[PDB]
Amino acid sequence: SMSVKKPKRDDSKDLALCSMILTEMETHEDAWPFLLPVNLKLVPGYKKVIKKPMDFSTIREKLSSGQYPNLETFALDVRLVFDNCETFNEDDSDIGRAGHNMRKYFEKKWTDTFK
């Protein structure tokens, strides 16, 4: 509270470390459904159903331009990618399986790096 602070967790490497994680996600063979924004002109249903589209290119731009105030807002956008994928895709589709695999991959990197 006012003039009573918890000890300072060192966040100075967070930007670099999120950049590294995102590089690993971008280069994963199952990243292909997630590399660019879904083309809202060509994919019926997507615009109306998915209220907050997100993709790895958009996260990379946000990260590069100081649009994440902290590592939790970064993790929110990553998880939004996989949440959207589950919303729109059957578990037993290639894209659906891709999304589950990438979520698993992310979450392990996240835990190993920060937790």
Domain residue ranges of the chain, discontinuous segments joined by +? 1-115
Residue 77 structure tokens: 């956008």
What type of residue is 107? E
Backbone angles phi, psi at 27, to 5 degrees: -100, 0
Contacts of 66 (CB under 8 A, 6+ apart): none
Residues 20/27, Cβ–Cβ less than 8 Å: no
Superfamily of domain covering 1-115: Bromodomain-like (1.20.920.10)
Residue 50 structure tokens: 């998915």
Residue 22 structure tokens: 């995102």
Residues 49/87, Cβ–Cβ less than 8 Å: yes
60-88 burial, b for 16+ CB within 10 Å, e for fewer? Answer: beebeeeebeebeebbebbebbbbbbeeb
Residue 38 structure tokens: 């879904």
Residue 73 structure tokens: 């807002």
